[PDB]
Design a protein around this ligand. Structure first.
Ligand SMILES: CCCCCCCCO[C@@H]1O[C@H](CO)[C@@H](O)[C@H](O)[C@H]1O
Ligand SMILES: CCCCCCCCO[C@@H]1O[C@H](CO)[C@@H](O)[C@H](O)[C@H]1O
Ligand SMILES: CCCCCCCCO[C@@H]1O[C@H](CO)[C@@H](O)[C@H](O)[C@H]1O
Ligand SMILES: CCCCCCCCO[C@@H]1O[C@H](CO)[C@@H](O)[C@H](O)[C@H]1O
Ligand SMILES: CCCCCCCCO[C@@H]1O[C@H](CO)[C@@H](O)[C@H](O)[C@H]1O
Ligand SMILES: CCCCCCCCO[C@@H]1O[C@H](CO)[C@@H](O)[C@H](O)[C@H]1O
Ligand SMILES: CCCCCCCCO[C@@H]1O[C@H](CO)[C@@H](O)[C@H](O)[C@H]1O
Ligand SMILES: CCCCCCCCO[C@@H]1O[C@H](CO)[C@@H](O)[C@H](O)[C@H]1O
Ligand SMILES: CCCCCCCCO[C@@H]1O[C@H](CO)[C@@H](O)[C@H](O)[C@H]1O
Ligand SMILES: CCCCCCCCO[C@@H]1O[C@H](CO)[C@@H](O)[C@H](O)[C@H]1O
Ligand SMILES: CCCCCCCCO[C@@H]1O[C@H](CO)[C@@H](O)[C@H](O)[C@H]1O
Ligand SMILES: CCCCCCCCO[C@@H]1O[C@H](CO)[C@@H](O)[C@H](O)[C@H]1O
Ligand SMILES: CCCCCCCCO[C@H]1O[C@H](CO)[C@@H](O)[C@H](O)[C@@H]1O
Ligand SMILES: CCCCCCCCO[C@H]1O[C@H](CO)[C@@H](O)[C@H](O)[C@@H]1O
Ligand SMILES: CC(C)C[C@H](N)C(=O)O
Ligand SMILES: CC(C)C[C@H](N)C(=O)O
Ligand code: NA
Ligand code: NA
Ligand code: NA
Ligand code: NA
Lengths: 509, 509
């Protein structure tokens, strides 16, 4: 089996798995939509009661499986729980990252296409004070790129440029993955993460210099970092905060598990896992939090900044920020640096969510790395046509896989490891080889608090939120539901084939 | 490998593969849409220049593959042509029958549901002369069963009854297939084919007694059997005639090939193949041709009968015929006998188009028959939800797979066997073990006339017909296109896995 070559390499690869579009695009919107500082308390609490303990659990399950030649959850769950149902529940750790990759790589491709156009100055020209006259050209630019519907049909028509850039983006992901863990992912992380850090710091500095008649970047920071204890009682804020913690730490996607499956059996995961998690959190709250929101607030004031965030997932990052930058000297190049940052952040994460399918095909069906990578890319490339052409298909996938799925899977993996496999065995396994030990209090957090917290969350979710989504959506949501259900049945079939191959092989040995 | 147990068994199974909904539903519409007797000359000529020679070619390829343990075209094409492209072209002999099964089993399920309701008398009551007042209730009955759209959305809503009957129909197909070739398919054919023949003869007799002020059944027969040489120049009629010959003989679906793969290496296929073909043709032109058209013509006259046929694929068989029968004593029970006939005709054919996927999984991935059958049923059952809920998805599948695909595949398989593998080797292989020999003239028909006839047909098709279909259809056709393209990529992946398994096994031996 492959292994990470260096400690630093492992840490930066895991940090790049985590630090992605979630930090720079998703966090500012979630924080802004949910009251700024009012979001931050539930967020910090979720980091402590869910993010940290689940991070250690995933690293441990991955390292444990990897020791036996298995890096993905159909096999790993079965190692932990010798029951046919383990293998079926395990399919979610292939299905979730595959479905997420299907829309995530497309959005990543937009950042590359925007980086290219901004570099070469093929960008809109706003009319030199009316905000709408400045924003409209950037709205039109995004809408033309991805091809937002102008009529009643729920159909998208991406530009030829966007489509070619998607192909290029898939090629770049493949170019890294095909080189494998140490020579591909790890080597890339050592270049990409320092680059990303420097680009991000530069942009934070530039933004901190923004001052207009409507405010300063300081006003943005104050909005994000001033607590509002009256919102601690709002379930929606808690649900938002927990969903963001899963998404941002890559938990419940089978991706931390698969990366950790390349950690040597004896090598520490306590300090390493904690470090990757903290690095992500710094990039999220310090870097991601200090760019878009303070820029928007400086230019528009808090109330308008908030309304922009609520407006769409992509408004702040693909329309508003470049529009604001366009009002400054060098602003087109600053937009380039922003999209380049987003691109490296996305790329280091998308390789992490394609690696589970790759590991499964290699570990369980015994494909060569080359074939595993190319068939993985083929399935993602083909499937992404749904997200490219069907309006809101992206939203539907992000909901089932990237929102509900990961929380369900996090609870599942915790129950399997800490309850079924055995709490003391799990605890022992997490701590084995640790440079530090997990604080004792965390045993009770993992065994009782985390699953209870998650279980309640899912119930309140399913009761007061999802009913309005199974009944109040356009009929075309069933196109995406049908297809991703088919993907699950497909992956289940592959796990069935893997077991038949194993059986036929055991009979020959 | 399994083998057919008896000569008669083999013949009736192959006759039941052929004799299906194509004979009783499709033929009358095609003949009626294309001038009755004006259709019949091109049809008879296509039977001689395409149907017969391709039937022998498929039996021979199947028997040839079966001798080496292979019943499906990815492997068989590769045996005939040791080239990677053979295996890829061979995927069409899994994809075509799977896609066709996906809509064909659903339509078969309607015949079972109608048989049930007609048996129990849960049928419409027409108002005792106005044709519309008699037809409308039967139109409404079909539209409620399958759930035709009442608004603008291209969405179907089948009744709960129709949905349960689809499940039952899948179960019945599975119940036969899971017993295998000799104890399942062959044993069923020995019961079903005589039943079908007797039901069909009874219905022809009953219809021949129809006389109304608008005409007699005799008028229907005269319309169908009176040549119109002025239509011999119409390409559309030729295209219609050839498409019907493929569909009705099950050619180009990989299904005759797979059945023939269970014929012993030494056993005759010349007389056997010819007999199955002739039996189908009698059931088509004598039985299928003498029921619906003469009934409709007797009641409505030729011009109206023709207009009914042009009205929809299903109007004549599911609306008009039962409406006409309802005007006669015992007419509800006669409708039962009609739908029961259609059900046995469909069932004996649907098992034939599921068997290729089953044979592939058994032969190439080494699944047990039980697992091959159940996974096949699962994929068909799941996929059929597209045809059940998306208006016109059925039409799109029937076009790409059941219309264009089979003609393309017929030409492909002929080129592979007779040109690449070798005309003299092919000829030798067809005739080996024959109780009779193929007439010498047919060597030149197979080598030159058949491929030339097909090639011209496809060109004239692609030039003067398909352009109007890639540009003049509703956007939702891309939902079905996307999904069936995904099915091809899926089957290609399975052929890739089969080759890797074979490779790993050869290295162990
Ligand atoms: C591998 C799956 C292929 C399914 C069909 C893909 C069709 C892609 O179609 C392409 O779309 C681009 C973006 O809109 C257009 O700019 C191009 O002109 C068009 O060829
Ligand atoms: C990495 C570089 C990818 C380049 C893809 C080129 C796509 C060209 O796309 C074409 O460009 C023309 C000129 O702008 C436009 O007028 C056309 O509408 C557009 O189709
Ligand atoms: C399901 C939650 O939808 C969320 O919408 C947000 C914008 O409102 C985005 O920032 C998130 O990516 C998306 O998950
Ligand atoms: C379910 C996902 C399948 C999407 C396949 C879409 C195939 C491409 O479809 C083509 O796209 C072009 C670019 O928009 C259009 O200009 C063409 O009119 C259209 O034929
Ligand atoms: C919500 C959970 C937050 C846990 C923060 C743990 C901080 C560390 O807590 C420390 O743990 C050590 C090891 O068990 C003990 O020896 C120390 O006395 C204790 O203070
Ligand atoms: C491609 C096949 C599409 C068929 C699905 C048709 C079912 C439409 O049903 C609709 O589904 C929506 C989404 O759940 C709901 O919001 C609506 O209440 C419901 O009427
Ligand atoms: C295996 C793939 C499952 C995808 C969702 C299938 C949903 C079937 O839904 C069923 O449809 C029937 C027919 O309209 C309705 O009568 C039933 O009330 C409904 O439960
Ligand atoms: C093989 C027998 C299958 C029987 C399936 C029963 C489906 C019942 O279906 C129900 O039947 C009621 C009474 O007719 C109707 O009023 C309801 O609308 C319908 O949903
Ligand atoms: C593609 C040809 O469409 C045909 O339509 C006919 C009704 O017009 C049906 O009888 C055939 O089944 C169908 O193939
Ligand atoms: C692409 C094929 C997917 C189709 C899945 C449809 C899932 C079922 O959808 C359900 O169907 C019922 C019966 O029509 C409706 O009454 C319900 O409103 C709808 O939710
Ligand atoms: C369109 C093709 C129709 C072919 C009909 C063939 C009828 C049989 O033709 C016969 O074939 C025998 C064997 O070669 C010869 O010995 C006979 O002389 C010949 O008449
Ligand atoms: C589920 C994803 C659907 C996206 C497909 C959108 C492409 C629509 O494009 C349309 O396609 C039709 C069918 O070929 C053609 O008749 C029209 O000319 C064309 O505009
Ligand atoms: C940042 C990592 C991926 C995030 C995917 C977010 C998916 C949901 O985001 C959605 O939010 C807005 C809601 O009005 C819409 O305007 C957008 O179309 C978008 O699909
Ligand atoms: C008989 C074996 C399967 C035949 C499938 C036929 C598919 C095309 O048949 C179509 O023809 C008519 C055209 O107006 C439509 O009314 C129907 O909805 C039907 O889909
Ligand atoms: C799905 C994950 C790889 C996403 C990543 N953690 C991010 O924040 O963008
Ligand atoms: C697809 C084939 C099995 C159809 C069959 N030959 C019929 O006439 O209905
Ligand atoms: Na992150
Ligand atoms: Na990343
Ligand atoms: Na037939
Ligand atoms: Na049949």
């Amino acid at each position: 089996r492959e292994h990470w070559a260096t400690r630093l390499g492992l840490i930066l690869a895991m940090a790049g798995n985590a630090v992605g579009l979630g930090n720079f695009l998703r966090f500012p919107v979630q924080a802004a939509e949910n009251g700024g500082g009012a979001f931050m308390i539930p967020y910090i609490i979720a980091f402590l009661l869910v993010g940290i303990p689940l991070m250690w659990i995933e690293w441990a399950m991955g390292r444990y499986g990897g020791a036996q030649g298995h890096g993905t959850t159909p096999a790993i769950f079965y190692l932990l729980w010798r029951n046919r149902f383990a293998k079926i529940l395990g399919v979610f750790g292939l299905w979730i990252p595959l479905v997420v990759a299907i829309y995530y790589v497309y959005i990543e491709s937009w950042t590359l296409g925007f980086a290219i156009k901004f570099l070469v100055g093929l960008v809109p020209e706003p009319p030199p004070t009316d905000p709408d006259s400045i924003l409209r050209p950037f709205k039109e630019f995004l809408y033309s790129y991805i091809g937002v519907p102008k009529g009643d049909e729920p159909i998208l028509k991406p530009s030829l440029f966007a489509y070619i850039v998607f192909l290029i983006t898939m090629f770049i992901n493949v170019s890294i993955l095909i080189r494998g863990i140490s020579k591909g992912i790890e080597r890339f992380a050592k270049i990409a993460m320092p680059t990303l850090f420097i680009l991000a710091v530069f942009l934070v500095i530039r933004v901190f210099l923004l001052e207009t008649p409507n405010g300063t970047a300081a006003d943005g920071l104050n909005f994000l970092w001033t607590p509002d204890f009256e919102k601690l009682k709002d379930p929606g804020v808690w649900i938002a905060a927990v969903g963001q913690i899963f998404f941002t730490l890559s938990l419940g996607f089978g991706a931390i598990i698969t990366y950790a499956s390349y950690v040597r059996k004896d090598q520490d995961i306590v300090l390493s896992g904690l470090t990757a998690a903290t690095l992500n959190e710094k990039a999220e709250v310090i870097l991601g939090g200090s760019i878009s929101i303070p820029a928007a607030v400086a230019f528009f004031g808090v109330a308008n900044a908030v309304a922009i965030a609520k407006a769409g997932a992509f408004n702040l990052g693909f329309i508003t920020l470049p529009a604001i930058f366009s009002q400054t000297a060098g602003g087109t190049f600053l937009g380039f640096l922003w999209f380049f940052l987003l691109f490296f952040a996305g790329l280091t994460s998308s390789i992490a969510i394609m690696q589970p399918m790759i590991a499964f095909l290699e570990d369980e069906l015994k494909l060569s790395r080359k074939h595993a990578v190319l068939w993985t890319a083929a399935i993602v490339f083909f499937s992404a046509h749904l997200v490219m052409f069907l309006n809101k298909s992206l939203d539907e996938m992000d909901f089932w896989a990237g929102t509900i799925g990961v929380v369900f899977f996090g609870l599942t993996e915790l129950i399997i490891f800490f309850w079924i496999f055995g709490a003391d065995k799990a605890w022992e396994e997490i701590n084995r080889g640790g440079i530090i030990k997990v604080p004792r209090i965390y045993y009770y957090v993992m065994r009782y608090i985390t699953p209870a917290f998650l279980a309640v969350l899912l119930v309140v979710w399913a009761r007061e939120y999802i009913p309005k989504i199974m009944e109040e959506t356009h009929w075309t949501v069933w196109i995406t539901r049908f297809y991703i259900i088919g993907l699950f049945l497909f992956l289940t079939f592959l796990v069935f084939l893997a077991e038949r191959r194993r059986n036929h092989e055991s009979a020959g040995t």
